[PDB]
Amino acid sequence: IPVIDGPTQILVRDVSDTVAFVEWTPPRAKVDFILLKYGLVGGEGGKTTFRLQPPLSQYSVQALRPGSRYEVSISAVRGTNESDASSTQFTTEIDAPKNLRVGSRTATSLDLEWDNSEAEAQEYKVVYSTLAGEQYHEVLVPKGIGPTTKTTLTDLVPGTEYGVGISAVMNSKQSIPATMNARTELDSPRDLMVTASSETSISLIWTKASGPIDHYRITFTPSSGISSEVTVPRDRTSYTLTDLEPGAEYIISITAERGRQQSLESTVDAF
Amino acid sequence: EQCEEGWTKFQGHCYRHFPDRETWVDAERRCREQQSHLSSIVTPEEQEFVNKNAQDYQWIGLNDRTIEGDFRWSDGHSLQFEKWRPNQPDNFFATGEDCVVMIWHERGEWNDVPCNYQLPFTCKKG
Ligand SMILES: [Ca+2]
Ligand SMILES: [Ca+2]
Ligand SMILES: [Ca+2]
């Protein structure tokens, strides 16, 4: 039976992933210090106690485990007499995954990897879009086994910048997303080949590159250093070279350009 | 005053596109090492030139980092011309969506995005 009264009506008004703002109304009468106790609800626990000065009707508790359930209590001591404790429970928010990176880039895919959250998350919500800010795609990625989780985004548009947000998910609860950006490669034309191979001209075919480009660029080199260039619009899938040496044994490269980006090369020879 | 090595002149100011990808704060911090600021865009003609000179997604100096929703140029210029993408700005991601990118293939229209993204940028001084 507590001789003396103490602080009451404890409140946890705001909580991030590692921090809680605790609030209470002070004791009516004299008290020489206040006790704030907190710890995990999960038996394998133990409490932290701070002894605070009587003026304070609030305190910020720090370095808490994310996605975990805590008990917090507040009481007063005067001489050898502890008061009743006002107690409440609360749950820290789920922490966002850390260290997002891109591995393999191609024209239509990005490989993502991130560190798993300290909190238990069965799944990760991966939300993405071009930076043009059209409607986002969404994808639930089961948690990887190790310290890390990977996924690959597919069917992306070549040569474009994506924004990605990854959130840890347990129950209906979500962490805020962690963000990063990445650029897909520009797609390359493939299978550029000879159609005609005459003494003055070479009529080339080639497998069209994919997604938005501006134009193709064919460079043609016969002698050691001297190399010339031509341009060809998007629409086209074949060109004819016209000014050349007689049966000169070339080797010819084609490439797609959009803005400041160019794609990897393709090549065949002509005699 | 005339135009330095690596810069190019447009309607009174000098400009330089840097292809190296940096966060918005680092891009602005780079610009300031050269007595410059991430570019502000005050007329359509400046839009068209800064877009056309870069031809890439890039940071400009518009941001709402100090007061959410209130976009300001890093160089103190008043906001009198805007060229936003449909439905932007939207503060999509609650963490740090406060910095503005020029979407080059869409007439160079602007989207607010996470400041932690790494992107090329253009600097501008007189
Ligand atoms: Ca903000
Ligand atoms: Ca914002
Ligand atoms: Ca946006």
Side-chain angles (χ1 to χ4, degrees), chain A residues 1-204 206-271, chain B:
Chain A
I1 357 172
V3 167
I4 208 79
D5 272 302
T8 61
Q9 304 168 260
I10 197 180
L11 241 167
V12 175
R13 73 199 219 163
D14 204 296
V15 312
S16 64
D17 66 323
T18 76
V19 176
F21 195 52
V22 181
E23 225 198 327
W24 66 84
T25 121
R28 313 193 88 214
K30 187 187 132 300
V31 171
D32 49 55
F33 62 87
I34 262 165
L35 290 185
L36 171 73
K37 293 192 180 294
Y38 66 88
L40 293 159
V41 160
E44 172 161 81
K47 308 209 109 204
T48 302
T49 295
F50 292 103
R51 161 169 159 286
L52 310 163
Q53 289 299 274
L56 297 170
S57 85
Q58 66 194 53
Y59 182 82
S60 190
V61 171
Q62 294 178 282
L64 299 169
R65 205 170 61 185
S68 301
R69 187 80 164 149
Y70 280 87
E71 237 241 315
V72 54
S73 64
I74 192 93
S75 66
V77 174
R78 184 201 127 282
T80 157
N81 307 80
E82 194 181 327
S83 89
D84 274 335
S86 191
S87 72
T88 183
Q89 275 195 10
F90 71 92
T91 307
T92 47
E93 208 50 31
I94 305 177
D95 63 308
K98 266 161 235 191
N99 303 312
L100 311 215
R101 359 133 151 80
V102 195
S104 296
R105 290 164 220 236
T106 76
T108 61
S109 76
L110 305 158
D111 280 354
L112 307 159
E113 188 180 3
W114 60 92
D115 290 355
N116 286 162
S117 296
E118 196 192 335
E120 263 188 3
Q122 241 182 26
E123 296 197 37
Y124 291 88
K125 199 171 111 154
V126 174
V127 158
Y128 68 89
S129 100
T130 72
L131 298 206
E134 93 281 351
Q135 172 82 282
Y136 64 98
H137 295 79
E138 199 183 319
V139 139
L140 284 174
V141 169
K143 184 221 220 260
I145 298 271
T148 227
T149 296
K150 293 176 192 233
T151 197
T152 294
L153 310 170
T154 60
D155 303 69
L156 311 179
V157 182
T160 114
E161 198 84 30
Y162 285 83
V164 181
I166 307 193
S167 290
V169 187
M170 191 66 179
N171 323 294
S172 28
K173 244 158 114 249
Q174 269 167 76
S175 64
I176 73 201
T179 68
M180 223 208 354
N181 66 300
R183 186 73 97 103
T184 53
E185 286 321 283
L186 210 66
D187 199 38
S188 304
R190 326 216 203 288
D191 298 57
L192 168 95
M193 276 188 76
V194 284
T195 334
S197 294
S198 306
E199 232 199 69
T200 306
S201 56
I202 300 157
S203 327
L204 299 140
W206 67 81
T207 291
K208 195 220 224 100
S210 167
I213 82 174
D214 287 340
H215 51 283
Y216 303 90
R217 189 177 285 260
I218 302 158
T219 63
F220 53 108
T221 312
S223 207
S224 285
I226 191 160
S227 55
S228 294
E229 307 188 293
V230 205
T231 248
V232 204
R234 302 154 289 195
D235 202 79
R236 259 139 162 285
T237 251
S238 47
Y239 190 85
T240 297
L241 310 179
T242 54
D243 202 338
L244 307 167
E245 286 122 85
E249 312 167 4
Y250 283 86
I251 296 193
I252 296 153
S253 128
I254 178 160
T255 191
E257 298 178 328
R258 178 157 114 127
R260 278 208 202 249
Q261 221 183 349
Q262 51 160 39
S263 74
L264 266 242
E265 236 150 86
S266 195
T267 296
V268 287
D269 41 91
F271 274 39
Chain B
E1 300 283 77
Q2 217 97 126
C3 204
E4 296 173 304
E5 161 171 3
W7 299 63
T8 126
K9 200 201 220 164
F10 187 73
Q11 277 170 25
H13 298 111
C14 281
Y15 294 81
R16 184 159 143 178
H17 183 247
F18 294 74
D20 283 307
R21 314 174 126 233
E22 304 276 348
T23 59
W24 187 96
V25 295
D26 289 349
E28 171 74 1
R29 208 247 329 289
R30 179 103 178 77
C31 287
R32 285 159 115 282
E33 284 169 33
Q34 310 223 226
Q35 287 78 74
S36 235
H37 288 129
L38 280 175
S39 193
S40 67
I41 310 283
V42 160
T43 65
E45 289 96 340
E46 202 179 5
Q47 241 289 126
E48 163 121 272
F49 171 85
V50 171
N51 190 45
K52 198 247 188 323
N53 180 71
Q55 285 173 33
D56 199 343
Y57 299 89
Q58 72 174 131
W59 290 129
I60 58 180
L62 230 220
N63 80 275
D64 77 323
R65 290 168 80 243
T66 97
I67 301 276
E68 183 52 48
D70 182 0
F71 284 87
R72 288 140 95 161
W73 293 117
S74 62
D75 68 13
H77 255 169
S78 68
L79 183 61
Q80 63 189 334
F81 169 78
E82 313 181 54
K83 182 113 131 206
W84 291 102
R85 285 246 81 220
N87 298 93
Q88 304 309 318
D90 63 351
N91 203 49
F92 192 78
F93 295 119
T95 290
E97 182 149 330
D98 300 325
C99 292
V100 175
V101 59
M102 257 209 293
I103 311 301
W104 81 277
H105 61 262
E106 294 297 337
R107 290 192 320 130
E109 287 167 3
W110 302 349
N111 181 16
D112 58 337
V113 294
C115 295
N116 63 122
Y117 286 174
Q118 297 141 104
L119 288 170
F121 54 103
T122 294
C123 292
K124 164 209 207 161
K125 61 168 124 177

